[PDB]
Symmetry: D2
């Protein structure tokens, strides 16, 4: 199956599969069961920013979520991605709704990767930035119900004319060019990513969440991966 490494912004607690009993941010390595988490003081109707970093020398993946004038929540996890992921991967963002729903609107997204070596000349580098989404992204791979709306916003899950989110939606958006995340002869490998989002919800318990994820080049939406599984995994093992 697909090899996932993800940073999830889980807004709906599904304690039956391991979630903390509150909206949280967590680092997933190959399973929906976060190897580490932190409570996310989720504020709906407000735009949020997620910054994600990793460096093969520090072996530490970390993330943070902040709102304007609101403290940030942080989470980390020591891991050596060279043991988890294959050389060539493909990044993307995902989201879902189940019984309950929220808008999984991505307002911006950037990503940078380096494959350093002997000199100040990263043998490889890749960078992309979006401060607005095109009506027809020729450089995105939209999966499921994802789509860019009239305002140049990326909508990972179904939303209607009025702007009301729909339940039971799944959607992903992968960048088009596969990234070479590590090479045997590499000295350092880095990558940073940022994305902005707006989650608004009608029901008192919003669900389910958005994630930023790295995966094998051919990652496609798993069957039965909806709702609580955030379109990343088939089961909850």
């Amino acid at each position: 199956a697909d090899t996932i490494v993800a940073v999830e912004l889980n807004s709906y607690p599904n304690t039956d599969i391991g979630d903390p009993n509150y909206p949280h941010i967590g680092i997933d390595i190959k399973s929906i069961r976060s190897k580490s988490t932190a409570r996310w003081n989720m504020q709906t109707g407000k735009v949020g920013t997620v910054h994600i970093s990793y460096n093969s020398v520090a072996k530490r993946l970390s993330a943070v979520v902040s709102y304007s004038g609101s403290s940030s929540t942080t989470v980390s996890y020591d891991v050596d991605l060279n043991n988890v992921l294959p050389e060539w991967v493909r990044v993307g963002l995902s989201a879902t709704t189940g019984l309950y729903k929220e808008t999984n609107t991505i307002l911006s997204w950037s990503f940078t990767s380096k494959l350093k070596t002997n000199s100040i000349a990263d043998a490889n580098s890749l960078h992309f930035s979006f401060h607005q989404f095109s009506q027809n992204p020729k450089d995105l791979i939209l999966q499921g119900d994802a789509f860019t709306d009239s305002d140049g916003n990326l909508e990972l899950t179904k939303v209607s004319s009025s702007g009301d989110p729909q339940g039971n939606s799944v959607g992903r958006a992968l960048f088009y060019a596969p990234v070479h995340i590590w090479e045997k002869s590499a000295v350092v490998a880095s990558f940073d990513a940022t994305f902005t989002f707006l989650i608004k919800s009608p029901d008192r318990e919003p669900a389910d969440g958005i994630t930023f994820f790295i995966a094998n080049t051919d990652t496609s939406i798993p069957s039965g991966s909806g709702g609580r599984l955030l379109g990343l995994f088939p089961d909850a093992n």
Copy 2:
């Protein structure tokens, strides 16, 4: 047909189709007949560097070619690419050999595009950089005889194990992701690029040349584009 815009390093004079009678660097807008050229003091055996830029306000396309120690040769052409190219395109490099041959080895390649608006936040940006090539670049589209070797050098045209260049070869390598080169609402749209190449040849007169081109996303080696047509155009019109 494909809508090409290229910068060529023509090593072989085909005076009968537009070439001056000497190695030259030219700018090609939709035809092999350069809208502008310059004498290139081609040095076989030395590694050379090519820089290329474009800024939709300055509306001028430039290109230099220098070798360590020896002087550079520049060439420009004022043009508004927003009228020549589609919004979405793919960038790439091509080379060819005809009756005569040379090695069309690419050692490094960068490219940066920025699509601005009302801030120091490019609504889009795209950057890639290669200082060595993977033996299976999953981010390059290799067309024709293009292949990356054991040394991590892109080889646009066939060479032998012993290193010898082969005749009659066409080769192209496009970056995988579509670049959003311009858009209606854009305020500024720019792009830079660099590549380093090494040309070697046993012939008294090496042929045919290397080009860095910008095409439509679905571009492909046109039939009968070998030799003097450098894998970009179907005929010499």
Copy 3:
């Protein structure tokens, strides 16, 4: 005296010294008498963006000014800055008020410079970005009445408690590190800059303007350079 190269956003027409009879943007090379201009459809109370570029191969300096949802004004000028400026320069922004006044509020500012050579390794590079100004910029050289306010905005000219601009004000802000803008052995030299501003004015004819300027490392405010002379030149020759 100081060697100035500037892009001026002249809001007040001083026809007695060469200005067009309308607010305009112009490229100044060593004199307040713009070697080139364009009418700027100045909109007060609205934030504007100025993008400025230059490339030693294209020998063309260009600028553009846009507002959200308003067309842009462009201006250019072919020039070879290697003949105008010294190797080491120091960039900055300036503004003034004379009999009339406006707020010369800079909201952001970025700058990048390259000194390319034989390889994809710019022998030199410099880049700085500000999306907010520190209460005490240790990296700016504030000249005259310039100062960063409580909101992290840079105010080049006097403004009072209420936020009302004052007449007869001059102020500049130079970045701290001198930039190496060209070197004899350089193949290409580039630089791009962006800045955001907000001009608001009580009187019907706002004056005088803001400029982005490159100058000799020790550029200081010229005597009598106030009002119409934008703090750059002593006289109007």
Copy 4:
């Protein structure tokens, strides 16, 4: 006293003050006694590369040192620089010789700092990159015997015309502009850096080492900091 934070490439063991009995790379927080070290298989005569990173969320400081072909040696230390360093600082490199000597030649040097907030718009960013050094760098602060030579290499410590290293020399080179390393409102604050160096020595045991350090803006070679104290500290406390 100066508040130093350094990464040292200690070539000479001064076991009596904290050094392991072998060439090592260490992280120094406010003292010559490394909070962490690693065996460095120092190779005289080969050019080496040092990469260093820090991310205030990951809160971990790392450093690698590799040579072409030979393996790299890494070293980290978890620390929150926001408690160790002032908001504004200057970066730099230092080196020294005592009874024994070696050449402390810096061939290249980059540095990038980013100070984030709520978007993919770093409220501040600063980047510089040198691939060769001007014979009169007006952007470097040279302290002690530091001097750039005819070949465009920074020489932290005295060498002769013939190239021979001299004993008892202290040398420092700081980038000119103050870096805003952190700020209260900041969400994320990171930094990367790279330098390439070449160490040569006639002595059976070369001394003393090179360091990349981060100090307070007004830093300066403390008296009696020669040799084993590598120009950073006044005493071995």
